[PDB]
Amino acid sequence: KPILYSYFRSSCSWRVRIALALKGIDYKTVPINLIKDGGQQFSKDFQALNPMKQVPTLKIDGITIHQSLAIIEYLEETRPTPRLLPQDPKKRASVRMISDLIAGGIQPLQNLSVLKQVGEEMQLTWAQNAITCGFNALEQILQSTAGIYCVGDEVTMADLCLVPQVANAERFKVDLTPYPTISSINKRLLVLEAFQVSHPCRQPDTPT
Amino acid sequence: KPILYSYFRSSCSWRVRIALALKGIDYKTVPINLIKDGGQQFSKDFQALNPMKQVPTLKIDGITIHQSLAIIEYLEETRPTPRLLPQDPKKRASVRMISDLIAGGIQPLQNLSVLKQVGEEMQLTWAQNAITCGFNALEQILQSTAGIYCVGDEVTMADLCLVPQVANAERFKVDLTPYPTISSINKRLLVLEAFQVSHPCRQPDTPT
Numbered sequence: 001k002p003i004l005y006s007y008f009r010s011s012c013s014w015r016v017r018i019a020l021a022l023k024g025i026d027y028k029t030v031p032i033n034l035i036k037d038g039g040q041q042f043s044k045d046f047q048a049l050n051p052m053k054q055v056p057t058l059k060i061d062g063i064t065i066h067q068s069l070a071i072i073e074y075l076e077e078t079r080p081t082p083r084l085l086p087q088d089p090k091k092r093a094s095v096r097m098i099s100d101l102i103a104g105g106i107q108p109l110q111n112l113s114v115l116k117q118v119g120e121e122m123q124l125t126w127a128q129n130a131i132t133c134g135f136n137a138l139e140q141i142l143q144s145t146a147g148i149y150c151v152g153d154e155v156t157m158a159d160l161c162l163v164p165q166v167a168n169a170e171r172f173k174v175d176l177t178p179y180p181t182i183s184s185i186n187k188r189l190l191v192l193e194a195f196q197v198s199h200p201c202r203q204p205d206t207p208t
Numbered sequence: 209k210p211i212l213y214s215y216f217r218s219s220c221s222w223r224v225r226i227a228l229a230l231k232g233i234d235y236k237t238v239p240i241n242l243i244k245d246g247g248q249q250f251s252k253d254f255q256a257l258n259p260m261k262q263v264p265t266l267k268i269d270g271i272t273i274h275q276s277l278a279i280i281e282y283l284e285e286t287r288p289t290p291r292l293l294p295q296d297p298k299k300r301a302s303v304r305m306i307s308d309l310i311a312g313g314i315q316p317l318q319n320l321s322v323l324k325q326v327g328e329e330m331q332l333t334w335a336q337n338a339i340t341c342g343f344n345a346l347e348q349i350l351q352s353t354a355g356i357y358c359v360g361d362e363v364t365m366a367d368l369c370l371v372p373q374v375a376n377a378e379r380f381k382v383d384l385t386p387y388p389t390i391s392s393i394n395k396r397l398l399v400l401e402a403f404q405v406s407h408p409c410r411q412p413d414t415p416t
C-alpha cells in the first residue's frame with residue numbers, strides 16, 4: 001500500500017493527493033504536523049526519512065521519493081492511465097513550464113520556513129508579492145495555453161499545481177480579480193472528484 | 209536556429225547551455241544583463257517575452273519556453289540522443305527529485321530578486337543557509353543514488369543542475385568540505401566538454 005507523508009494544509013502535498021486520486025491509487029496517509037513545536041518536519045525521524053524536512057514524500061513500489069513533481073511524474077510513467085501529461089511535446093512543455101513556475105517560482109518564496117525567517121511584520125506582504133508577481137505572469141501564459149484547463153481541455157499536472165496555489169492565494173487574501181483565467185480554471189477544477197476527495201478539509205489530519 | 213535568452217552568470221541559464229551542448233544543438237545567444245540598472249529582465253521588451261522576468265527562455269521549433277527544467281525535458285523528448293534521463297522510472301525519479309531539490313528548493317531562495325528584498329547585511333547569510341541546508345540534504349540523497357555522477361554512471365539532468373549550483377556555492381563562499389560526494393561529482397563533470405563550452409566564462413556576454 002503506498003504511503004504518503006502529508007500535512008493537510010500544505011499546498012505541495014495537495015498536488016500529490018490529487019494525482020493519487022486521479023490515478024485511482026489507494027494510499028495510506030502519515031501526517032506530519034508542520035506547525036506544532038517546529039512541527040514534526042524537524043523531529044529526528046522525519047529528518048531521516050526526508051533530509052529536506054518537507055512534505056510530501058511518497059513510499060511506493062519499494063522506494064522513497066521526495067519532490068512533488070518528481071513524484072507526480074513517477075506516477076504518470078508507472079500508471080499511464082488516465083494521463084496527467086499530454087502526448088505532444090510542445091503541450092508537455094507548456095504543462096511543465098506552468099508547473100515549475102508555480103512549484104519552483106512562487107510556492108518556495110511563501111514556504112513556511114522562509115516566512116519564519118522573514119519576520120511577522122513582513123510575512124503577509126512577502127507572501128502576497130510572491131503570489132501576485134507569479135500570478136501576473138501565469139495569467140499571461142494561460143491566455144495562450146488554456147482551454148478548459150491550464151493546457152488545453154484536459155486536466156494535467158499544471159492544474160494539480162494551480163488549485164493548491166490558488167487556495168494559498170485565498171489564505172493570504174490576495175485579490176484574484178486581476179486574474180480571470182486562473183480563477184475560471186480554478187472553479188472548473190474544484191468541482192472534479194479528484195480535487196475534492198484530496199481537499200485539505202477532508203484529510204485524516206484535518207482538525208475535527 | 210534556436211535562440212536562448214541567457215545571462216552568463218546565471219546558474220539557471222548554465223543548466224540549459226549544458227543541455228544544448230550535450231544534445232549538439234547549435235543556438236544563438238541573446239544576453240539579458242541581470243544587473244545593470246534593474247537589468248534588462250525588467251525592460252518592457254524582455255517582460256513581454258517572459259512575464260516572470262527571468263532567464264532562461266528558449267525559442268525553438270517555433271515556440272517559446274520558459275523554465276529551465278521544462279526546457280531541458282522538451283529537448284530530451286525532441287532530440288532523444290544522447291539521453292539526459294535514464295530509462296528506468298525509479299532512476300528517472302531520482303534525477304527529477306535531485307533536479308527539483310536544487311532548482312526549486314535551493315536556487316529560488318538565493319535568486320537575485322529575493323536577495324535584493326533581503327537587504328545587503330543579511331544577503332550573504334541568507335544565500336549561505338539556503339545552500340548549506342539544501343546541500344546537507346542533497347549529499348545524503350547522493351549517498352544512495354550516486355555512481356560516477358548524481359544518478360548512476362551517466363550524466364543526467366540532475367548533473368546539469370548540480371554544477372551551476374556548486375559554482376553558486378563557491379561564489380557565496382560556502383565550505384564544501386561537509387559534502388565530499390557533491391564535490392567529487394562536480395569535479396568529474398567539469399572536465400566534460402559540455403560543461404566547458406557552456407561555462408559562464410566563455411559566453412558572448414562574459415566581460416572581456
Ligand SMILES: N[C@@H](CCC(=O)N[C@@H](CS)C(=O)NCC(=O)O)C(=O)O
Binds near residue numbers: 053054055111112114
Ligand atoms: N519543491 C518541494 C517543496 C516541498 C515543501 O516546501 N513542502 C512544504 C509544504 S508546502 C513544507 O513541508 N514545508 C515545511 C516548512 O517550511 O518547514 C515539492 O514540490 O515537494
Ligand SMILES: N[C@@H](CCC(=O)N[C@@H](CS)C(=O)NCC(=O)O)C(=O)O
Binds near residue numbers: 220
Ligand atoms: N525556476 C526558473 C528560475 C529562473 C530564474 O530565477 N532566473 C534567474 C537567473 S538564475 C534570473 O533571471 N533572475 C532575475 C532576477 O532575480 O531578477 C528556471 O529554472 O528557469
